[PDB]
Design a protein around this ligand. Sequence first.
Ligand SMILES: Nc1nc2c(ncn2[C@@H]2O[C@H](COP(=O)(O)OP(=O)(O)OP(O)(O)=S)[C@@H](O)[C@H]2O)c(=O)[nH]1
Lengths: 301, 308
Amino acid sequence: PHNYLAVIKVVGIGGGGVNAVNRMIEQGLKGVEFIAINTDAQALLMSDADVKLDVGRDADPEVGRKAAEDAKDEIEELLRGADMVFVTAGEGGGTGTGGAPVVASIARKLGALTVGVVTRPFSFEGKRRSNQAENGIAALRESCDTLIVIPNDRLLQMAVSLMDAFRSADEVLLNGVQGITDLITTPGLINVDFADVKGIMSGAGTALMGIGSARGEGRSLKAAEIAINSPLLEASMEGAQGVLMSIAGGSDLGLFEINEAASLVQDAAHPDANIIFGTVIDDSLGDEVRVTVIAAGFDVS
Amino acid sequence: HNYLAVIKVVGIGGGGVNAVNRMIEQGLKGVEFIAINTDAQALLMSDADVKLDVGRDSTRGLGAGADPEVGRKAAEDAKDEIEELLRGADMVFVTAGEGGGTGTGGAPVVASIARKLGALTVGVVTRPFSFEGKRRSNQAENGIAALRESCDTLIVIPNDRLLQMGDAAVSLMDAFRSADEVLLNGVQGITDLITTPGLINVDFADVKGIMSGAGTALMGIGSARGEGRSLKAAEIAINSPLLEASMEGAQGVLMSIAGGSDLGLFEINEAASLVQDAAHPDANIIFGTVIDDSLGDEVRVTVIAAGF
Ligand SMILES: Nc1nc2c(ncn2[C@@H]2O[C@H](COP(=O)(O)OP(=O)(O)OP(O)(O)=S)[C@@H](O)[C@H]2O)c(=O)[nH]1
């Protein structure tokens, strides 16, 4: 599936996934195609995504899986020609959890680089029966090139109130897509080869994410140090066999400070890691920079 | 506190969704608008930020047939989904016209979810006009009782009182537009204190303090222009037919006065002094101001009375 404009499709499925996609649209995530797949028969969350599919008209993960399988031909036509496909059921469970692995499985058989994004709920939300959430991860993992896992519990170490906890979760979920897609789609001083992104993420397994932000003097080293040490990475970093790092910032981000952060991440990473590094121009940020680190794979000693 | 409060306004059922459309058309700022209904077509014409169609198999997109139990089940069936839309709100408004199936039965579900999450939860609903018939009146009564259980504060506006206000409504359509406007005035009279304060700043913490667990409430509205406007608008508000002449009895009162950026303390204080004198001798009264540079020489007073 060769392209020089990388075709990136972002699929939100189920109520939480469509809601995640609506937030990306509302925040102006650029360069990707949004697809909203509703999986529930009794309700429909509307969306401004350019492409929409209501497979429900026909809160169990099993119900979502069969609804998605029932619509496999339509989903495939929707995904055909993508170089990369993100799939997420977003926050909360339900039918989207059963549908996401089917979308992933189809994207991968098509040859797209297939990236799942899945959240672990906060421990205080309790647990609905049969271990559903943890079976959704395992199903998603069997059919993704890379599954990015966001353990929401680790956000309470980044003092957090309940509303702040929920909002922090929504924002890091949006970053699990945007951090990577911006690096591919929006030019910075340091640009990356999509084939290198593919070499890092194809068949790579589960990955964790870290984020950091800083302003003013020494901002790049500071934000990179926060990101590399993020509790959301759960110390995945020293074993990771593949590391992707993106620095978003204004047009005036200097080569020297860019290179300082690049050097820090190479020191932090396993000696044998592939490291993909680049920058993103976002003039809306003033003097803030924002760093995303994706750490994929594991040390096998 | 420098805290940025997140406010979500839910309209559920046809009347609630039309009220939310009116809030959007009048430029109410600082809040996210959510529309919930049992009719995919009506929702298509909503301008809300989030639109959720519920009860699709039970109603097949034609509303609850005036049956509140149908509306309750459609909302409850979509509880996890509604909760994920509300997650993160500091304050939630639930607005509807009581008396039909979708709003009557579904509003208490929305409010219970928001309350369980700990958001300050404010209902703003109408009673149907008496000419709509006794079944709608009874259904609304029951829906209001259920909603009151789920809200921190529930503001109830009787549509019958609207007919004693303003000019004689030409037509059913204009009367319901008047209902839309008063539901907007009830939401905006509170949220603009938080989102666009004037000289006397009443913030989210202050509003939570007086509206948490306050119970059933009434509203009055008044506006005037030119010389003596603040005293005039405040007197209209506290005599409002909507307040059912209950200002004297209220032990909790929130008042907001909106005016241009040149609304000054003398004027503000003249209106507050008027309202203090008409209030219960033990009333807790919070006075706040709103900047609204679109108003001209006009000021708008809103009074929320609770604690009877
Ligand atoms: N504010 C406002 N209220 C309305 C409007 N139309 C009707 N109402 C009031 O709202 C009440 C409930 O009507 P409506 O909201 O349309 O029903 P519903 O909740 O959607 O219930 P349904 O599914 O059985 S049709 C009516 O009895 C009437 O008093 C409107 O356009 N704006």
